[PDB]
Design a protein around this ligand. Structure first.
Ligand SMILES: CC(=O)N[C@@H]1[C@@H](O[C@@H]2O[C@H](CO)[C@H](O)[C@H](O)[C@H]2O)[C@@H](O)[C@@H](CO)O[C@H]1O
Ligand SMILES: CC(=O)N[C@@H]1[C@@H](O[C@@H]2O[C@H](CO)[C@H](O)[C@H](O)[C@H]2O)[C@@H](O)[C@@H](CO)O[C@H]1O
Lengths: 152, 152
């Protein structure tokens, strides 16, 4: 479950054998983000430090920081793949609110950009297989916009 | 004053016309950190996002993130200059506790590395002039190890 700041796998609701993965797991900035197979031991490029930067409660604003690279999960354009560029911690495109979206008692959450037009973290075309683009897309709390936070 | 997460100038107690500055203010990783003249408007390389990553209270652990570059304030060696390298948010050398050290009613704090041997954020040789090396040095809560957090 999501219990605030900590290190997590971020796991798509429709495909819980997958997690949120900084593609290629390199140290250079600007990686795109996709779903990928979790594996028995998740790799550091697929772990994320949720770090509080403003507020408290459901309105709290967080950076979602890649464990391997230290770069921040960022939305760059509506209905477009998200990435981990080098970017200021005060840039709202790199800040996210995490909101309960419990579904049949599954403790899942939406991940909502501080720039409201950039919307929610979204698995492209509702894919249930490894390697799907993760988008910032218009917020609807569809099933492909829901996520588990598995504490690590 | 320090009131938790937010963007701050971090100001040395002995020289309050100065602040903590990522030297050269470039985007490449690995800048060393020094005191430098604040100016009328502080520059982004001399502003820091304090971001909560674990715990609560005086024991809370924070990243101290450069506003300009997004790299984390890090201690690398005892009694050595501190820097902002590319580094994982889970590395304890990049995590700090901020502890009250009120002095004659001045609201100042110590900045203490999570790796206890790396010690406290320290103005080399108690300098009161711009351009002094900021070290990670043995923790004594000396006056050159005390800091204001001016909210920005
Ligand atoms: C094991 C390893 O490091 N492989 C490198 C590749 O990294 C993987 O990339 C996939 C996506 O193709 C995925 O992100 C996975 O989590 C990564 O471990 C990749 O960097 C490759 C170059 O394209 O080099 C491999 O050595
Ligand atoms: C105004 C500006 O950007 N100047 C550049 C220098 O940056 C300053 O560097 C000093 C330390 O010498 C200090 O960190 C200050 O805050 C910075 O603005 C520096 O990058 C210089 C190359 O060494 O280029 C200047 O253009």
């Amino acid at each position: 479950g999501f219990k605030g700041v900590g290190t997590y796998e971020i796991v798509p609701y429709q495909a819980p054998s997958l997690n949120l993965n900084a593609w290629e797991g390199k140290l250079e900035p600007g990686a795109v983000v996709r779903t990928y197979t979790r594996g028995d031991k998740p790799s550091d490029n697929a772990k994320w430090q949720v770090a509080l930067v403003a507020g408290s409660g459901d309105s709290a604003e967080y950076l979602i920081i890649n464990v391997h690279s230290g770069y921040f999960l960022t939305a760059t354009k509506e209905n477009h793949i998200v990435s981990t560029p080098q970017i200021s911690p005060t840039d709202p495109s790199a800040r996210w609110t995490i909101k309960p979206a419990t579904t049949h008692q599954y403790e899942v959450f939406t991940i909502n950009n501080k720039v409201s037009e950039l919307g929610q973290l979204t698995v492209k075309d509702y894919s249930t297989h490894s390697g799907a683009d993760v988008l910032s897309a218009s917020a609807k709390t569809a099933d492909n916009q829901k996520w588990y936070f598995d504490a690590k």
